[PDB]
User: Fold this.
Amino acid sequence: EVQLQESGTELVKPGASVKISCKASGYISTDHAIHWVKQRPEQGLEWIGYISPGNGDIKYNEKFKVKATLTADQSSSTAYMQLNSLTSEDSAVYFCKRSYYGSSYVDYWGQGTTLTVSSAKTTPPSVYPLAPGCGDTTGSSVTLGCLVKGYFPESVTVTWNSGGLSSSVHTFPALLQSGLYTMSSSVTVPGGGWPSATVTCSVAHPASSTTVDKKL
Amino acid sequence: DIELTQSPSSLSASLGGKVTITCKASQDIKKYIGWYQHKPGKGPRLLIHYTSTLLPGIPSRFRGSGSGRDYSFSISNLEGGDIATYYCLQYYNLRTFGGGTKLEIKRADAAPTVSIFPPSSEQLTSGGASVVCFLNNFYPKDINVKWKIDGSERAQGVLNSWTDQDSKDSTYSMSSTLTLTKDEYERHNSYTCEATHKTSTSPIVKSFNRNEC
Ligand SMILES: CCCC[C@H](NC(=O)CCC(=O)O)P(=O)(O)Oc1ccccc1
Assistant:
C-alpha cells in the first residue's frame, strides 16, 4: 500500500558525508512534498527541510542550510538527503514523510534510518560478573549484575539465566565511555543466597559474533 | 520560521485524570498548528490538525484549542496507553515543532534498594576497576547519587544511566559505575555510594570494605 521505505543503519566516520533515502511506493511521487525530520536522542524533533518533486522547490530550515542537501530521483521516486561534515552530534534517527493535505485519513512517515557517526570499529563486549561480596548476606534478596563493558556498535542482548530469570530484570541503557559503549543489567532473586542454578548472564553482540556466558 | 515554546516537558499524570499541554508561538500562526503523539518504537502518529480538527480514529478525549500564538492540547482521560511524547507543529510558515511533553505515570513515592558491587577480579587482571552501585525501584525519577572513596567525593569516572519507566510497577532504577585504574583502586579500601532521594531526608549511604571484608 503506500510505504515510504528508508535506508538501513548507516554507521559512518566523522567528517564524512552520508546519503539517506526515502523510496516512495504505493502513490504518485510528484503529488506530495517530502519533508525530512530529525529525531533527537532522549527527546525532541527537528524539521530539516522539504523537497516537492512536482514544481521542484526545496526549502530548508536556516539551521540546516549547510548541513543538508535535499534531492529526488524522479524516475524511481526515491528522495535522498545528504548530510555533509558529520560530527558526533548527527547521531540520530532521521525520517522522511510525505506531506499531509487537508483532511486525509492517516499521515505517512518512513520507518527512519539511524545514523550513528563515529571513528570506532567493531569490538566484542568485555563481560564481568557482579555478585555481592562478603557483606553479611544473612537475609533480604540478592541482586546479581553483569557489566557489559566497552563495545561497538550498539546491539547487545543480555539474557538472564538463559531466559529462566525473567523475574525482575532491569537492563540499563548503554552510554558512551571513552569512544565505546558500556551497559549492565540486574536480576533480583527471591531471598538471600543465589548458589543453586548457576545463574549466568549471557550477552550476545551481533556484529562480531560474540556469546559470552558468565556464570561465576 | 517561527519559534514554538511548548511546556511542560515531563508531566506526571494519574491514569484517570486530564493533561493540558501548551504551545505559544512567536508570530500569530492563524490556527495552522498540529499535535503529534510519539511513543518509543514507532514513528509519530498525527492526532489533531488545524488546531481543533480531530483525526479519523483519534478519540474525542483528545481535544485541541487556541488562536493567535497561544494553543492548548488536552487529554481528558489519561489512559494507560496515552503515555507518549506530544509535540505540536506549526506550519503557517515552514514547520517548527515544540520540544515535547514526555508523560509518565505519577504514583506513590518509593525508596531505592541500593547495592554496591566491588570489581570483579577479571576486571582487575585486565588492569581496571569499575565499582558499580545499583539503585533499583524508586519514584520519583530524581535521585542524586554521590561516589566517595575514603570519604573523598569523586565525581569523574562516574557513568550513570536510568531505566525507562517500568510498565508493570511504574518505578525507575539507576546504575552507577565508577571506572578507575587498577592502581588507583588498590591504593584505597573504602568506596561509598550515596543516594540523596526525596523519600528520605538522610542520604542512603552504602560502603563495602575492600576485599578483606
Ligand atoms: C499538521 C499537519 C499539516 C501538515 C503539513 N501540510 C500542510 O501544511 C499542507 C497543506 C494542507 O493542509 O493541505 P506538512 O505535512 O507539509 O508539514 C509537516 C512537516 C513535518 C512533519 C509533519 C508535517
In short: Residues 120-216 of chain A form a domain with the Immunoglobulin-like fold (CATH 2.60.40.10). Chain A touches chain B through 45 residues (CB under 8 Å). The pocket of HEP is lined by residues A 35, 37, 47, 97, 99-102; B 34, 49, 89, 91, 95 (CB under 6 Å). The CA atoms of residues 62 and 193 of chain A lie 60 Å apart.
